[PDB]
Amino acid sequence: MELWVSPKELANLPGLPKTSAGVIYVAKKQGWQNRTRAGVKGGKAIEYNANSLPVEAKAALLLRQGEIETSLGYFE
């Protein structure tokens, strides 16, 4: 299953600090498989594979995933 996450979205999980500045800085302490995509905003956008995040951030991630955006607007 594909489920990448952005630093700004990690700035809210408990295990991870509340500011992307701490996540990206801590990202070097490990280097979770981050896929870059210089085609969204304009400056190499960093991402994080949810499968690469530990369990404390994963479980917390799926938590704030309740209703993301459109697509499943039909509440499934």
PDB file of all heavy atoms in Angstrom, residues 10 14 29-30 38-39 43 49-50 52 57 63 67 69 73-74:
ATOM      1  N   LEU A  10       4.111  15.569   9.590  1.00  0.00           N
ATOM      2  CA  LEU A  10       4.732  14.821  10.721  1.00  0.00           C
ATOM      3  C   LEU A  10       4.892  15.765  11.913  1.00  0.00           C
ATOM      4  O   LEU A  10       5.017  15.339  13.045  1.00  0.00           O
ATOM      5  CB  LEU A  10       6.112  14.305  10.296  1.00  0.00           C
ATOM      6  CG  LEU A  10       5.972  13.303   9.141  1.00  0.00           C
ATOM      7  CD1 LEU A  10       7.367  12.915   8.642  1.00  0.00           C
ATOM      8  CD2 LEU A  10       5.228  12.040   9.616  1.00  0.00           C
ATOM      9  N   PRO A  14       3.114  12.495  18.137  1.00  0.00           N
ATOM     10  CA  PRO A  14       3.800  12.562  19.446  1.00  0.00           C
ATOM     11  C   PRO A  14       5.280  12.174  19.308  1.00  0.00           C
ATOM     12  O   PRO A  14       6.167  12.979  19.517  1.00  0.00           O
ATOM     13  CB  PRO A  14       3.040  11.557  20.348  1.00  0.00           C
ATOM     14  CG  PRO A  14       1.981  10.843  19.458  1.00  0.00           C
ATOM     15  CD  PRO A  14       1.965  11.561  18.092  1.00  0.00           C
ATOM     16  N   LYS A  29      19.026  11.589  11.461  1.00  0.00           N
ATOM     17  CA  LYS A  29      19.411  10.583  12.491  1.00  0.00           C
ATOM     18  C   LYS A  29      18.990   9.189  12.013  1.00  0.00           C
ATOM     19  O   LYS A  29      19.241   8.195  12.664  1.00  0.00           O
ATOM     20  CB  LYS A  29      18.709  10.914  13.814  1.00  0.00           C
ATOM     21  CG  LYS A  29      19.429  10.216  14.971  1.00  0.00           C
ATOM     22  CD  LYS A  29      18.713  10.532  16.285  1.00  0.00           C
ATOM     23  CE  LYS A  29      19.597  10.113  17.461  1.00  0.00           C
ATOM     24  NZ  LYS A  29      20.756  11.044  17.567  1.00  0.00           N
ATOM     25  N   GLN A  30      18.352   9.113  10.876  1.00  0.00           N
ATOM     26  CA  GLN A  30      17.908   7.792  10.340  1.00  0.00           C
ATOM     27  C   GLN A  30      17.896   7.856   8.813  1.00  0.00           C
ATOM     28  O   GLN A  30      18.615   7.139   8.145  1.00  0.00           O
ATOM     29  CB  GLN A  30      16.498   7.481  10.848  1.00  0.00           C
ATOM     30  CG  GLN A  30      16.522   7.333  12.370  1.00  0.00           C
ATOM     31  CD  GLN A  30      15.191   6.748  12.847  1.00  0.00           C
ATOM     32  OE1 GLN A  30      15.043   5.547  12.948  1.00  0.00           O
ATOM     33  NE2 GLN A  30      14.209   7.555  13.148  1.00  0.00           N
ATOM     34  N   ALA A  38      10.429  17.083  -7.452  1.00  0.00           N
ATOM     35  CA  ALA A  38      10.548  18.518  -7.837  1.00  0.00           C
ATOM     36  C   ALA A  38       9.516  18.846  -8.919  1.00  0.00           C
ATOM     37  O   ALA A  38       9.851  19.338  -9.978  1.00  0.00           O
ATOM     38  CB  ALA A  38      11.954  18.786  -8.377  1.00  0.00           C
ATOM     39  N   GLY A  39       8.262  18.573  -8.665  1.00  0.00           N
ATOM     40  CA  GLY A  39       7.204  18.864  -9.682  1.00  0.00           C
ATOM     41  C   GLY A  39       5.930  19.354  -8.987  1.00  0.00           C
ATOM     42  O   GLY A  39       4.936  19.636  -9.626  1.00  0.00           O
ATOM     43  N   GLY A  43      11.003  23.148  -5.881  1.00  0.00           N
ATOM     44  CA  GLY A  43      12.261  23.201  -5.084  1.00  0.00           C
ATOM     45  C   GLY A  43      12.522  21.841  -4.431  1.00  0.00           C
ATOM     46  O   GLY A  43      12.836  21.758  -3.260  1.00  0.00           O
ATOM     47  N   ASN A  49       8.128   7.790   3.620  1.00  0.00           N
ATOM     48  CA  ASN A  49       7.289   6.573   3.425  1.00  0.00           C
ATOM     49  C   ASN A  49       6.713   6.141   4.776  1.00  0.00           C
ATOM     50  O   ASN A  49       7.437   5.863   5.711  1.00  0.00           O
ATOM     51  CB  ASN A  49       8.151   5.448   2.846  1.00  0.00           C
ATOM     52  CG  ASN A  49       7.342   4.150   2.804  1.00  0.00           C
ATOM     53  OD1 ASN A  49       6.160   4.147   3.088  1.00  0.00           O
ATOM     54  ND2 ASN A  49       7.932   3.039   2.458  1.00  0.00           N
ATOM     55  N   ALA A  50       5.413   6.093   4.887  1.00  0.00           N
ATOM     56  CA  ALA A  50       4.785   5.690   6.179  1.00  0.00           C
ATOM     57  C   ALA A  50       5.336   4.335   6.629  1.00  0.00           C
ATOM     58  O   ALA A  50       5.457   4.066   7.807  1.00  0.00           O
ATOM     59  CB  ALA A  50       3.271   5.588   5.996  1.00  0.00           C
ATOM     60  N   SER A  52       8.250   3.409   6.402  1.00  0.00           N
ATOM     61  CA  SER A  52       9.624   3.634   6.939  1.00  0.00           C
ATOM     62  C   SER A  52       9.537   4.302   8.315  1.00  0.00           C
ATOM     63  O   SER A  52      10.447   4.213   9.114  1.00  0.00           O
ATOM     64  CB  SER A  52      10.397   4.536   5.978  1.00  0.00           C
ATOM     65  OG  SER A  52      10.469   3.911   4.704  1.00  0.00           O
ATOM     66  N   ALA A  57       5.025   6.680  15.258  1.00  0.00           N
ATOM     67  CA  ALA A  57       4.567   7.683  14.255  1.00  0.00           C
ATOM     68  C   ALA A  57       3.556   7.032  13.311  1.00  0.00           C
ATOM     69  O   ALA A  57       2.599   7.651  12.891  1.00  0.00           O
ATOM     70  CB  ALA A  57       5.766   8.187  13.451  1.00  0.00           C
ATOM     71  N   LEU A  63      -3.922   7.514  12.517  1.00  0.00           N
ATOM     72  CA  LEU A  63      -4.947   8.180  13.367  1.00  0.00           C
ATOM     73  C   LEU A  63      -5.382   9.496  12.714  1.00  0.00           C
ATOM     74  O   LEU A  63      -6.553   9.730  12.488  1.00  0.00           O
ATOM     75  CB  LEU A  63      -4.354   8.465  14.755  1.00  0.00           C
ATOM     76  CG  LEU A  63      -5.484   8.729  15.775  1.00  0.00           C
ATOM     77  CD1 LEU A  63      -6.012   7.404  16.340  1.00  0.00           C
ATOM     78  CD2 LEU A  63      -4.946   9.578  16.932  1.00  0.00           C
ATOM     79  N   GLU A  67     -10.424  10.451   7.239  1.00  0.00           N
ATOM     80  CA  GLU A  67     -10.944  11.462   6.276  1.00  0.00           C
ATOM     81  C   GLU A  67      -9.812  12.409   5.873  1.00  0.00           C
ATOM     82  O   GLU A  67      -9.549  13.394   6.534  1.00  0.00           O
ATOM     83  CB  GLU A  67     -12.072  12.262   6.935  1.00  0.00           C
ATOM     84  CG  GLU A  67     -12.843  13.034   5.863  1.00  0.00           C
ATOM     85  CD  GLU A  67     -13.829  13.992   6.534  1.00  0.00           C
ATOM     86  OE1 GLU A  67     -14.510  13.564   7.450  1.00  0.00           O
ATOM     87  OE2 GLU A  67     -13.887  15.138   6.119  1.00  0.00           O
ATOM     88  N   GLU A  69      -8.904  13.876   2.266  1.00  0.00           N
ATOM     89  CA  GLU A  69      -9.449  14.937   1.368  1.00  0.00           C
ATOM     90  C   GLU A  69     -10.639  14.363   0.581  1.00  0.00           C
ATOM     91  O   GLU A  69     -11.506  13.718   1.138  1.00  0.00           O
ATOM     92  CB  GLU A  69      -8.322  15.387   0.417  1.00  0.00           C
ATOM     93  CG  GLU A  69      -8.472  16.871   0.075  1.00  0.00           C
ATOM     94  CD  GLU A  69      -9.773  17.101  -0.694  1.00  0.00           C
ATOM     95  OE1 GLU A  69     -10.822  17.049  -0.073  1.00  0.00           O
ATOM     96  OE2 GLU A  69      -9.699  17.323  -1.891  1.00  0.00           O
ATOM     97  N   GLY A  73     -14.889  10.801  -0.700  1.00  0.00           N
ATOM     98  CA  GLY A  73     -15.925  11.717  -0.145  1.00  0.00           C
ATOM     99  C   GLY A  73     -17.213  10.936   0.119  1.00  0.00           C
ATOM    100  O   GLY A  73     -18.072  11.371   0.861  1.00  0.00           O
ATOM    101  N   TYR A  74     -17.357   9.785  -0.481  1.00  0.00           N
ATOM    102  CA  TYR A  74     -18.592   8.978  -0.262  1.00  0.00           C
ATOM    103  C   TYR A  74     -18.440   8.157   1.021  1.00  0.00           C
ATOM    104  O   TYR A  74     -19.049   7.117   1.176  1.00  0.00           O
ATOM    105  CB  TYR A  74     -18.799   8.036  -1.450  1.00  0.00           C
ATOM    106  CG  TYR A  74     -18.603   8.804  -2.737  1.00  0.00           C
ATOM    107  CD1 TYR A  74     -17.571   8.445  -3.628  1.00  0.00           C
ATOM    108  CD2 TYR A  74     -19.452   9.884  -3.046  1.00  0.00           C
ATOM    109  CE1 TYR A  74     -17.390   9.164  -4.825  1.00  0.00           C
ATOM    110  CE2 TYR A  74     -19.272  10.603  -4.242  1.00  0.00           C
ATOM    111  CZ  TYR A  74     -18.241  10.244  -5.132  1.00  0.00           C
ATOM    112  OH  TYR A  74     -18.063  10.950  -6.304  1.00  0.00           O
TER     113      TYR A  74
END
